[PDB]
Amino acid sequence: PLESQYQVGPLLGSGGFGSVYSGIRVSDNLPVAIKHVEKDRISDWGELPNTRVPMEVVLLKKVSSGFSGVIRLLDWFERPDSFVLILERPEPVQDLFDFITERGALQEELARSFFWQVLEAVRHCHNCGVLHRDIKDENILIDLNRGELKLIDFGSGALLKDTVYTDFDGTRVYSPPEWIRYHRYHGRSAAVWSLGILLYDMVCGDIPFEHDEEIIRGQVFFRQRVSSECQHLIRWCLALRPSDRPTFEEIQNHPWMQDVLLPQETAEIHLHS
Ligand SMILES: COc1cc2c(-c3cc4c(Cl)ccnc4[nH]3)cn(CCN3CCN(C)CC3)c2cc1OC
Numbered sequence: 001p002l003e004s005q006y007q008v009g010p011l012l013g014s015g016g017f018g019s020v021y022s023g024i025r026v027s028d029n030l031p032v033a034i035k036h037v038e039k040d041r042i043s044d045w046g047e048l049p050n051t052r053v054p055m056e057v058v059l060l061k062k063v064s065s066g067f068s069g070v071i072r073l074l075d076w077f078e079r080p081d082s083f084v085l086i087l088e089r090p091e092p093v094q095d096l097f098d099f100i101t102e103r104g105a106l107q108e109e110l111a112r113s114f115f116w117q118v119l120e121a122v123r124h125c126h127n128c129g130v131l132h133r134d135i136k137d138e139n140i141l142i143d144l145n146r147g148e149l150k151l152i153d154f155g156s157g158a159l160l161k162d163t164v165y166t167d168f169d170g171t172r173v174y175s176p177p178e179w180i181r182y183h184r185y186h187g188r189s190a191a192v193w194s195l196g197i198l199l200y201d202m203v204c205g206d207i208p209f210e211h212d213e214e215i216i217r218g219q220v221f222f223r224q225r226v227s228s229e230c231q232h233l234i235r236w237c238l239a240l241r242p243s244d245r246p247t248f249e250e251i252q253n254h255p256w257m258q259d260v261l262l263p264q265e266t267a268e269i270h271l272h273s
Contacts, residue, residue, distance in 0.1 A: 001077065006086070008034060017153045022089065025074075032074060033089040037155070038082050043169065044158070054083055059154040062128045069121035070151045071141065087152075092144045096137035096202075105205035105224045108256075113266040114140075115199050116257060117149040122191060123248050125151070131160045131187040134170035135194040137201055147267030160187055173197070173207055177216050177240055189242035192251070196237025203230055208238075229256035 009022035018037040025032050037054065046058035053076075060073035075086040096114070100106065106114070118140065125132055132139075134156040141150040156170045164184050168175060176193035179185045200208045204224045209215045218240040222231060233256045239245045251257065267273040 006032065006034060017155050023086070025086075031089040031091050033071075033087040035085040035087060036082050037085070040081070042083070053078075054155075055157065056155045057083070057085065059130045059157045059159075060085070060087075063125050063130050063154075065128075067121075067124050068148055068150070069117060069124055090141060090143040090146075090148075090150065093150075094142050094144060096140040096142060096149070099142055100137055100201065100205060106202045107270070108203060108227060108230055109261065110266065110270045111199065111202040111230075112257065113147070113261040113263070113270075114142075114149055114202060115195075116252070116260040117263065118151075118195065118198065119248060119252055121149065121151045122195070126160055126188065126191075126248075129160045130154070130157060131191065132157050133168065133187075133190070134174070135191060135198055136171055136174050137198060138171075142271070143263075143267075144271050145267060145273050147263035147265070147271055147273070149263075158187075162186075165190070170194075172212075173209055173215075175215070176242065177218060178242055180212050180215050186242060188248075189245045192237050192245045192248075193242075195251070196234050196245075199230070199237065200234050203234075227256070229254070232256070 005026055007024045007026055009024065012020045012022050012033065018035050021034040023032040023034040024030065042054045044055035045052055046055040047053065048058065057076055063070045064072040072088045073085060074088060077084040122132065122135065132151065132154060134153060139151065139153045141152055143150065164186055166184055168179055174194045174197045176185055176190045179190065197207055203226050204222060208220055218238060220235055220238055233254045236246050
């Protein structure tokens with residue numbers, strides 16, 4: 001142990017998720033990402049099956065398995081003042097936020113493939129009892145070679161439950177109106193709301209709401225040409241009342257989600273890889 005298993009490379013990014021470095025595991029030259037999180041900033045703590053660890057570690061372990069769609073936790077270390085998490089690192093990779101910044105609004109065929117993969121990944125998290133609570137383009141990585149998307153940054157998540165949530169530390173512009181008005185939400189329809197924001201972001205090039213009162217009003221204006229089926233799915237996910245929002249099954253059965261590209265054909269056509 002003790003930092004002799006990994007060569008540290010450039011800093012990839014830093015923020016609310018801590019500091020993430022590009023890395024290489026020296027045992028087999030495996031590309032990894034090294035994330036440092038200070039203990040002082042960790043708000044939620046969990047406990048592993050038979051030790052006091054951050055909730056992010058608990059959630060990552062519950063979702064780290066053969067399914068690609070979530071960036072997997074390979075290992076973790078505890079330091080006196082911080083936790084260090086070893087995560088897989090696709091190569092090459094670009095976060096969805098910067099991908100949208102460079103390309104603008106995405107073609108609906110590309111947005112369909114991306115959105116479908118996000119749904120499959122979120123469904124996987126829920127099946128494992130994990131609620132992400134911060135679904136957004138900044139927390140999605142693109143494997144440019146394979147055309148596969150990856151969820152990251154579970155540092156705001158929680159265990160999935162069927163009762164109401166009264167806390168939230170995700171991105172406010174992605175939060176549902178029931179959180180803005182009442183500080184109450186249930187996990188999955190809040191998730192569907194954020195998926196609606198995400199889908200609008202992909203097909204329009206930016207998020208639909210910037211202020212609390214626009215979220216509360218829930219009125220969706222499209223600044224780009226978007227098909228009627230895509231507009232309908234977005235407005236469905238952005239329904240004001242949580243119970244009017246579609247389930248994951250209803251999203252993936254929607255007419256706009258039919259005949260999705262596979263990941264590798266997505267990369268060949270739209271990522272030219
Ligand atoms: C590889 O290039 C980048 C990677 C990241 C990451 C990041 C990568 C990563 C991996 Cl590989 C595993 C686990 N977490 C990660 N975060 C996180 N970020 C920054 C994400 N957000 C970009 C927009 N900024 C306003 C807020 C932060 C990355 C930025 C990168 O290029 C600008």
